[PDB]
Design a protein around this nucleic acid. Structure first.
Lengths: 754, 519
DNA sequence: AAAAAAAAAAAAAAAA
DNA sequence: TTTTTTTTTTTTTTTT
């Protein structure tokens, strides 16, 4: 009994950590959606059929249920009252709470049997501020979305203060969702594609309808949780739609009549779609759940769409004709948007056209429908040539690092590497007299170097060549940069490609917070995932700052300053307060010292500012040094970050605090121990595969990542300012070393500083 | 989006800064403490892990290169082998860190044999370059895959940066440090320990100048003084040449006994031939190389109508018998490049040894306290062996036996009473809570101690093993006292450091090769 | 005098 | 068996 009150007080001390931002009124709606989510979780088991939510005039929200009838709960701790009535086992029982404190035996009898629990919770005005009432629009929108996703589930809503009403009951479900989305717009064909097939436990539901708006709007959900950034379901949906429509145009010969090849963003143009998925164990990129990264979901959506969209197109010739006409019109507009050009001879088996032996050329004779991939070597060349599209994509493998044309003379450009590059592009860049960029053979030149340091250097050298020798090609936007991944990381079924080490760090944090629950008290609910994620992000930011500050001060002292009370400027005036503060700091440092360091304090009385600043002596490795915490440090901004994190982490862990990762459990005494345990448990089944260039990637892996136009992630090189680009190229790549050294040292100091 | 525009300025800046910082931190410059680049550090760590001890049999160079590339170094073979080749050959390094078998090249310009032919083994000095690595004396950084760990820096005992020198090129910076004599460098370190406010004049008295592996002559000393004060200076290295005069006839021959540093003998002979053919240098009748594997001997026969001294001076001025060695002492200090003079390098090395010895003593003290805890458990168990075997027999499983042993407090025997109270405090591990241990003549075992008692074999019940445990406990108490004495006094730390440096000077002492002259 | 060009030391990228 | 680049100091050619 006493344990319950401790949990209620733990929740009520930091209500923002559990329910969310209480200032702007998100917490109240989160409480309402918590109760309604409990009701809908009851309803998913084929028991409930009606959820009458209400908004009384007394600023109270009832969530009635007609279902089956049913620690410390977050919802009843914040609210100042409950009215719990459960009409179970033939007798009505009633319970009353007040700030989570029950006042009843929790057992009453009444007439009529019925089923379901109705819970009227009264939000406390103390915890929440600036938003007392409930916005009808937010609840109406979310409840209608839940009604669409959970088909065959009545969800009433009755605003009693106004007398409004709603009755969301759509047996169609996703088709009703698409109709609701398209009711304001003009759909271009009458029928709506739809399936709800389930396979391997991944229930998949999709719908489609095109309109005249030429706007893309694809919504995706996973267990009734929207994904702002899409995910694997979105990728599989796009891939299957593009494949099916391209195959349909190829079979029926629509494209040959128009003499234009449709691509992605033409099929998706003017599209409305909803993609609802139900994974039993979903995996997300973060605790916000804005992106699904579950590897098993792409294949299921791809297979089901590939079958059923083609099956729909076969049985609906008129709607297929209308959609294909729209896609042809979009492709014609895209073709008309292009610059004038001429056909070019391509290297082939019958005719080599006087092109290099290492060029694996494509079949498309038209530039603006062809690509050139400039790769780093012959092994990367083989890996790229094995996996590509022979129609569009050509490869020209280089040989390691190329000449620095900034340092090299014009006549020094007689190397086999640069001549081979000039022959394939056919700009005739040598001489600066025959240089005609209109005869460029590819209007997409892709610098697909390796994903490492020397790959970056070779990319810089190629950019120097293209900016200095072929400046108009860069201006017209023909130069692109691929972004192949450096790491592949696997945990059993899960797989992900990671580009940078910063992305690796973010992914490691994401696994560490995956399925992790942190309990500040033994009898208390776990923290919210987003709150713990924000705590860990701020903690890592401060740790990076402290590592940057490692030379000026010891890391142990700065880490201990997080948990100590703050020291304002007014504290510096008093001799006694600074002495007590620094004495407590040094005693805490001495107590937790695992090495030979010995901490001592002193106070230097400044006669100018009339202050008493503290000093922290330390004797590490036999070397004695003093670290005065001057007036600059107290208001230096670094100490402000330390103090903010300290204010967040003063009392988030009582004596009996612990963390869990599902089955596993661990008591903790500090946030460091919890973070270390979570990271250690995260890296158990982990396996990182670093790619030392594209020769280690399989052709299928290289195709899936950064050759497929569906899953490509490119960058157009552009020149914002000519003068700044010229100055930067001359400084970084010229002959003189002193400006280069100054630039490197300045950027090092900038990185060390803010 | 599939396609997102990026400015050419931002892309170039980010890519080139990533490359420059990567080269500067990792590959180009050395670390001031251990004087090794990451490739050298990873090669030595891989050889130590394989067990390429100086007294063990050789191993093929291909195995070492494959081990380094597969585990630690992600930057491709045929450069790791070049590093091993340079470390294995005596004309490059003043003190070789690798003991090689086969053809590793020569000053004549012959290239080393391929990776499949040579064999590789650590030098004896490389073991002192990696002393007490297992006692957590240095921080271990993760592998590129995260599957293993590599030392961040080696716990060296030799000042490798000053001793073997270095030479490398970064994007902005470029280091060029000459090698020195180990005895003189250790004497400078000892003088610094004696007086840390020692002047560079005193460090120059102890360290007159560099000592190249190829014995030679250094003309000036202003360059050495400028290098050791500012970190930069120009030194002129001369060849040992004598105009030997024939007694019978007046004809003379110029015999070059020794050659400057990083000078190829074949290219020198070729350049002298080019100068003679073009008639830029007169007086030379013939040119030969008579190196009989007993040093070297480049014979240059002077004509009758030539003084010979003038010919030798002209060869010094024009040919590569004089080379300017530009000292540029750039090294990583606290993970950033910095131009460092002699006293900075010596101070950094002494700080490194301070840290290494302190961490080693902490590790040894923790180990000794843990073993003393276990030995207390074993002694108390053998004092009360009969009720313990009876309890273990009565219990059904080892877990219930452990719980029973932890629950029951145990009487101290006479031998255990005399043993434990003689130790007194300063033997319990720090992590141990005050509930456990001796409390009013009754031991309170932990879970770990009960597990150790369950793991006790019947061999330990013999009479000799109890005396062995008593003796080991006394030895561990004495070791704990000595370790606490080292960790308490700052002067004893320097006593240990000075003794180690003197032993290193004694074991690997060597004589000067190059001569510093006045001109 | 001047100014540019070439070669050479050691870690890296590439192949033939 | 063999060869091409990046990168920074320092010298030697050679050419004016």
């Amino acid at each position: 009994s006493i344990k319950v009150l401790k949990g209620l007080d733990a929740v009520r001390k930091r209500p923002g950590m559990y329910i969310g931002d209480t200032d702007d009124g998100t917490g109240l709606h989160h409480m309402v959606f918590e109760v309604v989510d409990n009701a809908i979780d009851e309803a998913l088991a084929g028991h409930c059929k009606e959820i009458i939510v209400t908004i009384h005039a007394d600023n109270s929200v009832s969530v009635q249920d007609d279902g089956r009838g049913i620690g410390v709960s977050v919802v009843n701790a914040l609210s100042q009252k409950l009215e719990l009535v459960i009409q179970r086992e033939g007798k009505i029982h009633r319970q009353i709470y007040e700030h989570g404190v029950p006042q009843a035996p929790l057992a009453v009898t009444g007439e009529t049997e019925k089923t379901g629990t109705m819970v009227r919770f009264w939000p406390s005005l103390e915890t929440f501020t600036n938003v007392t009432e409930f916005e009808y629009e937010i609840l109406a929108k979310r409840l209608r979305e839940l009604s669409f996703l959970n088909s065959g589930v009545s969800i009433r809503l009755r605003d009693k203060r106004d007398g409004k009403e709603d009755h969301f009951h759509y047996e169609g479900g996703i088709k009703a969702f698409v109709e609701y989305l398209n009711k304001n717009k003009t759909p271009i064909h009458p029928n709506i594609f739809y399936f709800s097939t389930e396979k391997d436990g991944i229930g998949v539901e999709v719908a489609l309808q095109w309109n005249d708006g030429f706007q893309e709007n694809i919504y995706c959900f996973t267990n009734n949780i929207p994904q702002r950034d899409g995910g694997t379901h979105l990728a599989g949906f796009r891939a299957a739609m593009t494949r099916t429509l391209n195959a349909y145009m190829d079979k029926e010969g629509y494209s040959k009549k128009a003499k234009v090849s449709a691509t992605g963003d033409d099929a998706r143009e003017g599209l409305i779609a909803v993609v609802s998925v139900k994974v039993p164990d979903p995996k997300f990129s973060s605790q916000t759940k804005d992106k699904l990264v579950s590897s098993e979901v792409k294949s299921a959506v791809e297979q089901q769409m590939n079958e059923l969209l083609a099956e729909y197109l076969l049985e609906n010739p008129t709607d297929a004709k209308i959609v294909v006409g729209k896609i042809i019109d979009a492709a014609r507009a895209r073709e008309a948007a292009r610059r004038a050009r001429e056909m070019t001879r391509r290297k082939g088996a019958l005719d080599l056209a006087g092109l290099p032996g290492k060029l694996a050329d494509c079949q498309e004779r038209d530039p603006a429908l062809s690509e050139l991939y400039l790769v780093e070597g012959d092994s990367a060349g083989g890996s790229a040539k094995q996996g590509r599209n022979r129609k569009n994509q050509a490869i020209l493998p280089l040989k390691g690092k190329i000449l620095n044309v900034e340092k090299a003379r014009f006549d020094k450009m007689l190397s086999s590497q640069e001549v081979a590059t000039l022959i394939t592009a056919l700009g005739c860049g040598i001489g600066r007299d025959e240089y005609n960029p209109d005869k460029l053979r590819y209007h997409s030149i892709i610098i697909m170097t390796d994903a490492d340091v020397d790959g970056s250097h070779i990319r810089t050298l190629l950019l120097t060549f293209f900016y200095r020798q072929m400046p108009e090609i860069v201006e017209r936007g023909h130069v692109y940069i691929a972004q192949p991944p450096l790491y592949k990381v696997k945990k059993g079924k899960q797989e992900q490609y990671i580009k940078d080490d910063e992305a690796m760090d973010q992914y490691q944090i994401s696994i560490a917070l995956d399925g992790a629950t942190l309990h500040t008290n033994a009898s208390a609910p776990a923290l919210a995932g987003e709150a713990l994620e924000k705590l860990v992000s701020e903690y890592n930011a401060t740790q990076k700052m402290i590592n940057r500050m490692e030379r000026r001060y010891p890391k142990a002292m700065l880490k201990e300053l997080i948990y100590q009370p703050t020291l304002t400027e007014a504290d510096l005036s008093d001799e006694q307060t600074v002495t007590r503060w620094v004495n407590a700091l040094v005693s805490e440092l001495n107590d937790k010292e695992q090495h030979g360091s010995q901490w001592k304090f002193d106070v230097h009385t400044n006669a100018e500012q009339n202050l008493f600043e503290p000093i922290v002596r330390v004797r590490t490795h036999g070397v004695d040094t003093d670290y005065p915490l001057d007036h600059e440090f107290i208001t230096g901004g670094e100490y402000r970050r330390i103090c903010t994190l300290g204010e967040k982490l003063r009392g988030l862990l009582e004596e009996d605090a612990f963390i869990e990762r599902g089955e596993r459990r661990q008591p903790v005494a500090s946030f460091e121990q919890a973070l270390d345990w979570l990271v250690k448990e995260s890296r158990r089944g982990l396996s990182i595969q670093r790619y030392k260039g594209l020769g280690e990637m399989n052709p299928e892996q290289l195709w899936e990542t950064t050759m497929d136009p569906e899953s490509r992630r490119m960058l157009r090189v552009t020149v914002k300012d000519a003068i700044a680009a010229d100055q930067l190229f001359t400084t970084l790549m010229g002959d003189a070393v002193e400006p280069r050294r100054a630039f490197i040292e300045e950027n090092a100091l900038k990185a060390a500083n803010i | 989006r599939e396609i997102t525009p990026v400015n050419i300025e931002e892309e170039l800046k980010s890519s080139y800064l990533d490359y420059a910082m990567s080269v500067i931190v990792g590959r180009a410059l050395p670390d001031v403490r251990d004087g090794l680049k990451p490739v050298h550090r990873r090669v030595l760590y891989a050889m130590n892990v394989l067990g390429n001890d100086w007294n063990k049999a050789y191993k093929k160079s291909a195995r070492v290169v494959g081990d380094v590339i597969g585990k630690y170094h992600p930057h491709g073979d045929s450069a790791v082998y070049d590093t091993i080749v340079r470390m294995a050959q005596p004309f490059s390094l003043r003190y070789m860190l690798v003991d090689g078998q086969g053809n590793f090249g020569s000053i004549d310009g012959d290239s080393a044999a391929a990776m499949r032919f040579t064999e590789i083994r650590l030098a004896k000095i490389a073991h002192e370059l990696m002393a007490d690595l297992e006692k957590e004396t240095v921080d271990f950084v993760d592998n590129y895959d995260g599957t293993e760990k590599i030392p961040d820096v080696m716990p060296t005992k030799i000042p490798n940066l000053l001793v073997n020198g270095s030479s490398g090129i970064a994007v902005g910076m470029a280091t060029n440090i000459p090698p020195h004599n180990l005895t003189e460098v250790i004497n400078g370190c000892l003088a610094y320990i004696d007086d840390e406010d020692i002047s560079i004049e005193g460090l120059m008295e102890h360290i007159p100048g560099p000592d190249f592996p190829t014995a030679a002559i250094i003309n000036g000393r202003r360059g050495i003084e400028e290098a050791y004060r500012t970190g930069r200076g120009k030194v002129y290295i001369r060849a040992r040449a004598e105009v030997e005069v024939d007694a019978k006839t007046g004809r003379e021959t110029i015999i070059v006994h020794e050659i400057p540093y990083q000078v190829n003998k074949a290219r020198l002979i070729e350049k002298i031939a080019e100068l003679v053919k073009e008639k830029r240098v007169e007086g030379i009748s013939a040119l030969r190389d008579e190196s009989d594997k007993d040093g070297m001997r480049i014979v240059i026969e002077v004509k009758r109508d030539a003084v010979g001294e003038v010919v030798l001076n002209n060869l010094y001025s024009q040919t590569q018998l004089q080379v300017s060695f530009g000292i540029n002492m750039v090294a990583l200090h606290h993970g950033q490049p910095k131009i460092m003079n002699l006293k900075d390098i010596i101070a950094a090395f002494v700080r490194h040894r301070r840290e290494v010895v302190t961490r080693r003593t902490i590790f040894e003290l923790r180990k000794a306290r843990d073993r003393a805890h276990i030995l207390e458990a074993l002694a108390v168990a053998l004092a009360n062996i009969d009720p313990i075997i009876e309890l273990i027999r009565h219990a059904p499983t080892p877990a219930e036996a452990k719980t029973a042993l932890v629950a029951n407090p145990w009487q101290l025997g006479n031998v255990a009473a005399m043993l434990e109270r003689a130790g007194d405090d300063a033997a319990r591990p720090e992590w141990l809570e005050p509930e456990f241990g001796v409390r009013d003549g009754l031991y309170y075992l932990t879970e770990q101690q009960a597990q150790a008692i369950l793991d006790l074999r019947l061999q330990k019940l013999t009479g000799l093993e109890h005396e062995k445990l008593l003796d080991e406990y006394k030895e561990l108490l004495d070791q704990i006292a000595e370790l606490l004495r080292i960790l308490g006094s700052a002067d004893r730390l320097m006593e240990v450091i000075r003794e180690e440096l003197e032993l290193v000077r004694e074991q690997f002492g060597d004589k000067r090769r190059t001569e510093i002259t006045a001109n």
